[PDB]
Amino acid sequence: WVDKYRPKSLNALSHNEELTNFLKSLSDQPRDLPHLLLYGPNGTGKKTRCMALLESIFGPGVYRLKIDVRQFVTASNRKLELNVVSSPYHLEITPSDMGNNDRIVIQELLKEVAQMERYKCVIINEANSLTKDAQAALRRTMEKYSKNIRLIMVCDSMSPIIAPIKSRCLLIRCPAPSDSEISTILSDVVTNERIQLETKDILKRIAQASNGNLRVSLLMLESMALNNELALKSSSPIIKPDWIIVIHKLTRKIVKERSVNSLIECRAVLYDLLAHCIPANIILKELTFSLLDVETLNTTNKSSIIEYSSVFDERLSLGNKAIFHLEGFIAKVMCCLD
Amino acid sequence: QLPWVEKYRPQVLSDIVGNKETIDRLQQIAKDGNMPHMIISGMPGIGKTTSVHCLAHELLGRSYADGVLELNASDDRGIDVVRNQIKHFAQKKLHLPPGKHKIVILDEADSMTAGAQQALRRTMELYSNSTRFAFACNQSNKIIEPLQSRCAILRYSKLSDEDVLKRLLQIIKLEDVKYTNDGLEAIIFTAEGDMRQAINNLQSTVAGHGLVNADNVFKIVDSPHPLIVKKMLLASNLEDSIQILRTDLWKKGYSSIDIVTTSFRVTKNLAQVKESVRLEMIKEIGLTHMRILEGVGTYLQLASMLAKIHKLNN
Amino acid sequence: NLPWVEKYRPETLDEVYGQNEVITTVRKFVDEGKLPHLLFYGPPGTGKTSTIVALAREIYGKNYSNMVLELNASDDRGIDVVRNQIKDFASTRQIFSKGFKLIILDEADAMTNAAQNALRRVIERYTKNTRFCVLANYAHKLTPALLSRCTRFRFQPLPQEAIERRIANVLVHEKLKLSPNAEKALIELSNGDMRRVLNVLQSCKATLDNPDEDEISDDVIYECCGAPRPSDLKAVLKSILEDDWGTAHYTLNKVRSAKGLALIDLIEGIVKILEDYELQNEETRVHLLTKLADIEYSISKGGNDQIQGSAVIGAIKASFEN
């Protein structure tokens, strides 16, 4: 559904006319394209911009790409593998499957691709999960090979990137789509999908409740179209994912009851949420913002909430067993709210 | 000369002092003979190797030279060894009493490569009718999970104070040494459970200063003096503590790690202050230690540690 | 032609300074002939290596090239090295050797726990045909068994008299003049490591040898060492404690820029200065020490320099309010 209405060119883009104009400007120099560092919130379509730029420079056949697996041996006697999706002109490295061996794989793969000889494109996904050693190796690779490897790295909140890397690449940002433009894209979607709308207020409602995240907005429109039989009326009970509802029920249990007898069940809910492929930082952010949204608290309680949330977010980023820090944060929250 | 730790090493199982449960377990094992494969884990110098050696000796009697294969960190333990030599030793015919078995004693099992530990699996599973394996390790986490599960785990707690005191008193009585109670308490302090280190420090004190006295022990240990560190950690005004740490400890070339470790050890034994304040002082000293180990060892860190300890004590 | 660090290396037991308490002991050990396994440990630039090489050359004379084996840290140092090389050298008996060999392990604190266990087992096995000597900077990273197996020797830093005697001997044997405050600043900045002294001396020699007669002032010493002058420290502390925020910020910035000052060493000097003030209250000292230690710990991870500078200024100012 969503992927069926994904643009495949800079002209097919229907958002951020400034950004598409600047990319049309940059695509005028296929012989000299500096390194790019795209940064912006999740679901803004930075990968769409990158693939459209690639389609503008190279042929439109860049979108039919094949997956491949590559296994290599490290300095020690461990032989580990990764999966790269490659195209006739570019390859996408995602140093996320591997835990601490980012530097060796990035070094080896870049040095191997940089001896194929008109250049090649390397798309680095999740450029914030790179250890500083891997980042330094990447910068030295950029320093050595500059005529075959033109790096384009997408990321969000580009604080964990050392200034030695920011200097070489062109910093490009992708602001979230405004509610008006989200509503426009939703209207185009429902028009090309002949969805029977009762009014246009549902589109603005979804744009507002989506918090400027384009892809989750489109996906929740998809999810709601299959619950109203393609006839979206004004009485639409907006559908949230399962984990958001679980986190909101946890927030309501925290607010309504403040005791260890409820902290046990809170730890149980945290265990059940974590064991089903959900990060710790996402749970912490959602729980903090949900607790801040509650209207029964004053300003001092909210200040204590945000301070403890910051402290335990730092501790989560420093630790390894997330359940401990999550239980500690919830215990301190229950203490302050008591 | 001769090291006391080597001269007075227990050869009979009954002479071992320390854990009362596992030594009786091994006593009953030697009494019966049906010994299973066993990993023996615990902190250094608490009687791991001597235990298994005495067990093998008492279990096999006159056939120890022919029915025991020992492998320590010195001998080569790779893939070829575990495949050829251990396998040819397990199959070796040997007529022993009905309950006994050939013994393979692998000391420092942690250094054995995981790939090398793989080969031992079927070799010890198949020939369990005439061969038993005894691993001796410090940390039972570096042993692969199969070997971890095939054998019985035997944990050895660190030595208490009364057991080390009894052993040291036995050694003194056997050696006719002049001593005093404060010297023995200082030995217990500088040992913290290491029977080997306790005996060696005792022998070094006796050889160097003749009489076992507090100042002699604290001059031969080359560690910061516990009394002066206690005075530092218990001074009323902060400037006195800072001056003590500056002039009496920092000038004489002591390593910051040693200062923090001595402060930790003396704060553990301050049986005059309350329990909660002791725990909080230990927390502060440990945070300072963790800061020191991360690469920074400036005097300012120890100064801040003393400042926070005083702030807690106020 | 060779640097002074390699040239002025001692060759006899007499040419070592500030270590008499250990020199008399090693002379007793060499005249007795009962030399056991030794552990030499202490801060760098003290003379452990020089002392042990001189002792070996004295005990074995010309046979030094045969009965003395020197090994260093991490020479492909798996368990295989301790199994082959050290074990062969220890076990193998020479053709015409009387006594015992000597294996000196330099900077041998970088050994893993398994390597140290192999080494302790080896030294336990062949303790009758050879003696070992282990050198270390930190005696807390060694297994207590290996420590207990040998006799310890801590190398206290070189006192002022020893370093002054050594720099005098270097001065009379070279074409250099040294001003009275020069040696004072030298001893204050070196903290007692002879190697750094012998390095900085030839450095400032090659630096200011324009007419072969220039005097080494404290400026060139502070430049070559890269350490601030106490006057600048007093001035910046005065500006922080007296002036307002903007002027103090500009003063700190210019002092740390025009001279190249790191916040770590600046904080070290500032707390050294504040250590001797007559503070009337106590909470000021506690808050000052705590905040400054926090600043140093945060700097240890490389944050934003200007933010840590402003935080230093704020801590120093808000501490002095009683």
Binding site: - | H88, Q91, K92, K93, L94, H95, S130 | -
Partner: protein
């Protein structure tokens, strides 16, 4: 317990070296009739049996039957020491944990006694029953060894055919193919060049090349090797000895 005295020490050396490459651990059942041994290959495809009666021993005295299970690499390392003109002697004590091998020189006092540590093996002793083999033949051992060493250089399988009093060996590899045929005949001038043949059913079997290359090493024991082939049963290769026999049971391949 047992005392066995060989006449020539080279005999047992050749016996051991004949099949020391097909079995790593063998069991020697010492009875009063002599020495009997059987051992299965590590892949359970090639069995080896060995019989040596009392006639091959100058003096053989066994108190009661026993089982000496020893290695072959160590036994070959030991047997490689003694010279040819010696008097090998095998001795074992009660409850034998080790066997003693004495090497005595007839005209000297140079006695060299070696000790060997016996191994422990589960006695998976299967009993062999005589079967009426369809094809029974005998041919010079050198001829068979040459034929195997020539054919094995092509593939990993060799096909044997017995049809209308004709022997045939066939090999088909990727580098080519080869075939040899043998006609039975006899010569009064030298009976050591005759190829006997007694066929009851024309048989077609296929065997592995490596196993035949390991078997043909027994050509140093005797000169006339016998072969018994059946339609589906394992083939029997026999080398006769002055007092016994060495037999290789080989398992055929599948179609």
């Amino acid at each position: 317990m047992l005392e066995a005295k060989f006449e020539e020490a080279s005999l047992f050396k050749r016996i051991i070296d004949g099949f020391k490459d097909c079995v790593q651990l063998v069991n020697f059942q010492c009875k009063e009739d002599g020495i009997i041994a059987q051992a299965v290959d590590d892949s359970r495809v090639l069995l080896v049996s060995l019989e040596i009666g009392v006639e091959a021993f100058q003096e053989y005295r066994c108190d009661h039957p026993v089982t000496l299970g020893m290695d072959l690499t160590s036994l070959s390392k030991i047997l490689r020491c003694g010279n040819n003109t010696d008097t090998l002697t095998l001795i074992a004590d009660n409850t034998p944990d080790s066997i003693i091998l004495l090497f005595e020189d007839t005209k000297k006092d140079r006695i060299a006694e070696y000790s060997l540590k016996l191994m422990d093996i589960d006695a998976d002793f299967l009993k062999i029953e005589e079967l009426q083999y369809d094809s029974t033949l005998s041919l010079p051992s050198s001829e068979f060894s040459k034929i195997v060493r020539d054919l094995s250089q092509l593939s990993d399988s060799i096909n044997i055919m017995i049809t209308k009093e004709t022997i045939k060996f066939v090999a088909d590899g990727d580098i080519g193919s080869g075939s040899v045929i043998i006609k039975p005949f006899v010569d009064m001038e030298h009976p050591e060049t005759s190829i006997k043949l007694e066929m009851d059913q024309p048989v077609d079997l296929t065997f592995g090349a490596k196993y035949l290359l390991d078997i043909i090493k027994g050509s140093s024991l005797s000169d006339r090797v016998g072969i018994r082939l059946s339609s589906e049963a394992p083939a029997l290769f026999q080398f006769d000895l002055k007092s016994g026999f060495l037999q290789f049971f080989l398992a055929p391949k599948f179609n």
